């Protein structure tokens, strides 16, 4: 058995499976073991086939630590129009064996870079968001028609108004596919004559020699004369394999190494940032046991043993600011839905019953009043009336513990005493029944979280005394006989209540005494400490981050107090209410028609009711705030309190709202849903009957020891905690808020300025219905990436998601407000999307987007110049002399009797169908099928050359043999016929194939050319020959393989925004993630 955490395990040959969790080298989420009983509790994930008496966690936790054993690259090099050559030396001969020549690059006539992220990867739990691009012969247009042109005129194209949103969302997916951690793996030293003595890494798989040529380019020697064999001969030899390693090990495997392999500088930068975010997050079990000691209010200690290790990574510490943002989102989740808060309050109402020592047994009242009977002659009797009204046979006390649970949640929900617990239609103190109804009401009123409960308590008796004693009012329309149920708001508190001196005792003595008792002995609010600072954060706002304010004065908890303690506030309250009731009955000034004299029986059944034995007012001040403060950090929706006052309509809260826009902007006032309530939150009704009988009857067990009872009740509910998952959820919630407020502001107009990288891609100023579906499409991508089936980021979508910063405020009655604006820390996914947008600004080519514009015009030549890099003869712009710029109002008049048809430019002049023009693309999209009728016969044969300015466009290539005839009209006209008003197909280019030997010259017809340089995607042409004679010439890009070919370069250095580098320096890790263990030791 274990001698570290004293765990009893039966077989002595799987003890390593337990002591690996203590950090000792020889599945579960957390593992606690008690100190006084043989009963460990194990908490396991929610997708199981069975359980070994194991509990679950119903928390939608994200997957933060995911591992990657393969290559950390996302770009790949594909062959396209392959070829073979005759060669010199074919293999390496050692003695008799022959080893074939493997190459790091595909031997083809043309080869160019495409993007297939995670193409050499061995992860577990893929993020389910890939960016897969076909080679540019195939159609790459299904990426850009992804969301927003769901309705489209033509399914064979893409909307040019949505290019920015689609490119930006696939930059988001390109980031979200690279949230992994690199995994250390085994190595293999070789002795080949080009990689002598290096320690190459072997990928996890059956074969190892297969990946070595792809990863390590210098291992292939220089057998013959080639472009690849020229590049490798230009490279250096020392930097290959592992650079260095860690000092600490476990046996022979070191903890972290770094290697020199084919990778992406952008991908290793993203994974370095994601590494640092998790490294800024962990915690040690010393702080775990500190937090679980402090949270338990000293009724139980806790200890968690562990061995010293740097391998530990348990990401749980988050900042204080992110809990507040997650709290605001969880408040906005409600939206005046009564459904989404009923299993929040009913559930805690059950849990408090299961923890509480208090046993509400209503037979104490029946035992005190069974001896009180009445004579056989007379009719009406107070002792039978109170028992027929209280009804102690009914044993459902849920209205008591829902009220106890509602103290944590004013502002989202407020509890009131229900209608039909007041006196029926007035109340009229002559009546017998309404006096007991007033008693049961006024004893249960101080426990609701209602700010107008004292005014309700006063106006109930003011209604009942109508006709016997009068009080002044203000405006002759709110008479004394206005029902006390209507006094629900702070603007209904009368002048006679707020100033006692207006109530004259010569007219209303009992109203004067009843106002004075409320102004003296109504219970005072207080606050109590809870939770942990410096671990777990603090998810409250408008309060100090550690106090829990509740409307009752609490006391330090002992047991042996006197039952009839009038220092106790609620016992003082019961005594004062009974004393005023027996002041009311005493004189019979108010009850004519009583034919008997009920003053003796009434005063007796009030005296037997005042000094009743009842441990509920002792409990609610000594042990109930302790039980609230213990379970308050463990809740899934942590408490959200708005400050308690009494008898003061200057700090009474009236209204809670969530501001979505910024501070220095004036927009439409979009008040939230929660501001449209009469009281401060959702109104909740309670029965005063079962609150009152629960106050009147309550006892403890006759062997109650607190250090046993609470140390036994705290343990199984801390053994099923989920606070450690709810901390991890809030990083993702705050990051999703920041990702929305950056990425929506990229496409809409607002006042959130962040750096605005990509603008040349065209779009439209998106309105609310467009930005909302874009933001929903961000949401459903992030939940897919992090395995989140619960709600996340969804309350920020009903309405206007063009937002800047979350805030929440309430106002008090006199007009002043309190504004809490939770500041933000750094966000990782947002500025990594900003970084890859900066990279995309220079490497637009590699994702298949072309920048600039095209020129539709016939070129009849036999030259070989590849129309993505045109010569400056064929291009023209607004600086070129004699170029007509066409605005929107281009109108075509036909020629009459042999005249040429003409069109109007921007300056009003009519020009013939001839020369050099500049359209914007919007003109052709407006007047397709019309411009398509007249312009084609002039473009195909005449001298019309049109420049369609568009900024961004997808492209696909069509390679042709440059020694045969080629006409581009069947591609160009097919592109022109398909431009519908809501979409455009990808621009077809007809670029030639380079060759090794010199070829025959054939005429070529081309119509569509580009404007600027447009192939940084092209990797190499004829990468097996000595040289490329005819065609486009492109050697191996030496600037992407920087650190080999550059002698005075440190290995760390990259150029990040200008051009991404291959063959980087990646550091690989191998961590542990032990489950949270704790030995829970009781306290004497």
């Amino acid at each position: 058995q274990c001698h570290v955490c004293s765990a009893v395990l039966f077989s002595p040959l799987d003890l390593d499976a337990h002591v690996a969790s203590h950090g000792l080298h020889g599945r579960h989420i957390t593992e606690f073991i008690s100190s006084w009983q043989n009963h460990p509790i194990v908490q396991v994930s929610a997708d199981v086939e069975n359980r070994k008496t194991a509990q679950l966690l119903h928390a939608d936790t994200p997957r933060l630590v995911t591992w990657d054993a393969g290559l950390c690259t996302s770009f790949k090099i594909v062959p396209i129009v392959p070829a073979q050559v005759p060669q010199d030396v074919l293999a390496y001969t050692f003695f008799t064996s022959s080893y074939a020549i493997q190459s790091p690059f595909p031997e083809a006539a043309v080869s160019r870079i495409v993007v297939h992220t995670r193409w050499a990867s061995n992860v577990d739990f893929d993020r389910d968001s890939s960016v897969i691009m076909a080679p540019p012969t195939e159609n790459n247009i299904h990426l850009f028609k992804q969301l927003l042109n769901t309705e489209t005129l033509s399914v064979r194209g893409a909307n040019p108004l949505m290019f920015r949103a689609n490119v930006l969302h696939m930059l988001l997916e390109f980031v979200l596919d690279n949230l992994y951690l690199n995994r250390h793996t085994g190595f293999s030293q070789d002795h080949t004559p080009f990689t002598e003595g290096a320690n190459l890494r072997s990928l996890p798989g059956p074969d190892a020699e297969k990946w070595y040529s792809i990863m390590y380019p210098t291992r292939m020697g220089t057998p013959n004369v080639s472009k690849i064999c020229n590049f490798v001969a230009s490279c250096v030899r020392n930097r290959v394999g592992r650079f260095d390693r860690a000092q600490m090990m476990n046996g022979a495997m070191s903890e972290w190494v770094d290697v020199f392999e084919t990778s992406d500088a952008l991908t290793v930068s993203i994974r370095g940032r994601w590494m640092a975010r998790l490294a800024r997050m962990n915690i040690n079990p010393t702080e775990i046991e500190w937090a679980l000691t402090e949270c338990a209010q000293g009724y139980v200690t806790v200890t968690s043993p562990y061995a010293p290790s740097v391998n530990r990574l348990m990401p749980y510490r988050i900042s204080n600011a992110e809990r507040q943002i997650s709290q605001i989102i969880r408040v906005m989740n409600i939206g005046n839905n009564a459904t989404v808060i009923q299993p929040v309050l009913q559930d805690i109402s059950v849990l408090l019953q299961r923890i509480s020592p208090l046993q509400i047994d209503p037979t104490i009242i029946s035992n005190t009043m069974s001896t009180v009977s009445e004579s056989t002659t007379q009719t009406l009797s107070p002792a039978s009336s109170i028992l027929g009204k209280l009804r102690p046979s009914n044993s459902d006390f849920s209205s008591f513990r829902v009220a106890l649970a509602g103290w944590l949640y004013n502002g989202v929900v407020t509890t009131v005493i229900d209608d039909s617990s007041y006196p029926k239609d007035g109340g009229s103190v002559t009546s017998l029944e309404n006096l007991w109804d007033f008693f049961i009401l006024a004893l249960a009123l101080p426990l609701t979280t209602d700010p107008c409960a004292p005014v309700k308590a006063f106006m109930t008796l003011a209604n009942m005394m109508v006709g016997f004693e009068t009080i002044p009012m203000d405006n002759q329309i709110y008479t004394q006989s206005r029902r006390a149920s209507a006094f629900s708001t702070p603007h209904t508190w009368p002048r006679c209540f707020m100033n006692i001196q207006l109530i004259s005792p010569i007219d209303a003595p009992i109203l004067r005494q009843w106002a004075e008792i409320i102004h003296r002995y109504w219970p005072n609010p207080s606050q109590i400490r809870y939770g942990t600072p410096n671990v777990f954060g603090s998810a409250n706002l408008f309060t100090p981050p550690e106090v829990l304010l509740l409307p009752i004065d609490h006391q330090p908890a002992n047991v042996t107090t006197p039952t009839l303690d009038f220092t106790n506030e609620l016992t003082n309250w019961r005594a004062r209410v009974c004393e005023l009731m027996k002041n009311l009955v005493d004189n019979q000034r108010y009850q004519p028609g009583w034919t008997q004299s009920l003053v003796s029986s009434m005063r007796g059944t009030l005296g037997k009711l005042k000094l009743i034995k009842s441990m509920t007012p002792m409990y609610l001040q000594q042990l109930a705030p302790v039980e609230l403060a213990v379970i308050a950090p463990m809740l899934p929706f942590p408490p959200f309190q708005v400050p308690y006052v009494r008898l003061d309509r200057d700090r009474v809260p009236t209204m809670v709202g969530v501001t979505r826009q910024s501070r220095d902007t004036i927009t439409q006032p979009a008040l939230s849903l929660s501001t449209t309530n009469t009281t401060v939150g959702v109104p909740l009704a309670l029965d005063a009957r079962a609150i009152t009988v629960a106050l009147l009857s309550g006892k403890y067990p006759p062997d109650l020891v607190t250090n046993v009872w609470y140390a036994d009740a705290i343990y199984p509910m801390y053994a099923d905690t989920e606070v450690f998952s709810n901390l991890q959820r809030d990083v993702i919630t705050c990051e999703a808020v920041q990702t929305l407020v950056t990425l929506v502001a990229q496409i809409s107009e607002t006042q959130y300025p962040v750096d605005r990288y990509l603008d040349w891609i065209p779009s439209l100023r998106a309105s609310a219905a467009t930005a909302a579906t874009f933001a929903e499409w961000v949401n459903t991508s992030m939940k897919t990436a992090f395995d989140l089936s619960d709600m996340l980021l969804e309350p920020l979508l009903s309405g206007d998601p063009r937002m800047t910063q979350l805030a929440i405020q309430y106002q008090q009655y006199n007009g002043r407000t309190f504004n809490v604006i939770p500041e933000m820390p750094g966000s990782v996914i947002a500025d990594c999307v900003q970084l890859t947008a900066e990279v995309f600004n220079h490497e637009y080519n590699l994702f298949g987007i072309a920048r600039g514009d095209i020129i539709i015009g016939r070129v009849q030549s036999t030259h070989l110049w590849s129309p993505l890099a045109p010569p400056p003869d064929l291009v023209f712009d607004r600086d070129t002399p004699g170029v007509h710029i066409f605005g929107r109002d281009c109108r075509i008049s036909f020629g009459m009797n042999g005249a040429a048809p003409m069109i109007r430019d921007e300056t009003g002049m009519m020009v013939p169908f001839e020369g050099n023009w500049i359209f914007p693309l919007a003109l052709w999209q407006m007047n397709t099928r019309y411009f398509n009728q007249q312009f084609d016969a002039w473009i195909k044969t005449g001298e019309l050359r049109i420049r369609i300015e568009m900024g961004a466009y997808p492209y696909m290539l069509h390679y042709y043999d440059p020694r045969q005839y080629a006409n581009a009209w069947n591609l160009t006209s097919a592109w022109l016929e398909e431009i519908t008003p809501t979409s455009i197909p990808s621009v077809p280019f007809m670029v030639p194939i380079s060759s090794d030997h010199d070829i025959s010259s054939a005429p070529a017809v081309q119509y569509i050319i580009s404007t600027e340089y447009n192939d940084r995607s092209l990797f190499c042409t004829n990468s097996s020959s000595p040289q490329t004679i005819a065609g486009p010439d492109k050697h191996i890009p030496v600037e992407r393989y920087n650190i080999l070919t550059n002698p005075d370069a440190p290995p760390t250095q990259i150029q990040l925004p200008e051009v991404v580098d291959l063959y980087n320096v990646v550091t690989r890790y191998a961590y542990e993630t032990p489950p949270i263990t704790a030995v829970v030791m009781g306290v004497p």
Binding site: S373, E374, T376, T379, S381, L387, G388, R391, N394, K424
Partner: protein, 185 residues
């Protein structure tokens, strides 16, 4: 959603008629209510009261807050049923009156029972209670609160009437619902 059509709608029969394509509506989610009994109940309702009170009461009634009546024998058979085989006496009862009911062979000679029975009211135990003097407005307004309503008389309008005692003592929604009375609530 609740719409109202100018025809008697029963759930089991007007689906067989169709009854909604008959007005010209092409059409699951359309659940029919049984407003068969309310028309005969209205015809029995109109002969005692006036018209306007009955109609203006029935107008203010939603047909989604599902509820029911309860009809009890008046006073003598009410106490006699509690005297009988079930001791199903509610907890609202008088402590002395249930004690006199739990005994055997009560009669006119018992002064101690009769003195309390002649001052006992049904409105003490059951609330809210429809008596014969109540307006038809307050019947439906009290009916829209608490899912069961105690009465004294047959002549009520609204939901279905169910009885409290044996006769020896007496003298499921969907999205779209149709009915035959326009609600205002």
């Amino acid at each position: 959603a609740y719409i109202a059509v100018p025809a008697v709608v029963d759930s089991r029969s007007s689906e067989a008629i169709g009854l909604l394509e008959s007005f010209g509506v092409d059409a699951n989610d359309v659940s029919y209510q049984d407003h068969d009994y309310v028309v005969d109940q209205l015809q029995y309702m109109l002969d005692g009261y006036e018209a306007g009170d009955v109609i203006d009461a029935l107008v203010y009634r939603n047909w989604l807050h599902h509820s029911v009546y309860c009809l009890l024998p008046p006073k003598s058979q009410l106490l006699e049923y509690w005297k009988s085989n079930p001791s199903v006496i509610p907890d609202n009862v008088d402590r002395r009156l249930r004690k006199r009911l739990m005994l055997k062979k009560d009669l006119r000679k018992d002064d101690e029972y009769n003195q309390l029975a002649r001052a006992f009211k049904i409105s003490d135990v059951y609330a809210p209670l429809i008596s014969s003097t109540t307006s038809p407005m307050t019947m439906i307004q009290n009916l829209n609160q608490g899912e069961i309503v105690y009465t004294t008389t047959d002549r009520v309008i609204g939901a279905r009437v169910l009885l409290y005692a044996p006769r020896k003592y007496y003298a499921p929604h969907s999205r779209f619902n149709v009915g035959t009375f326009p609600s205002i609530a």
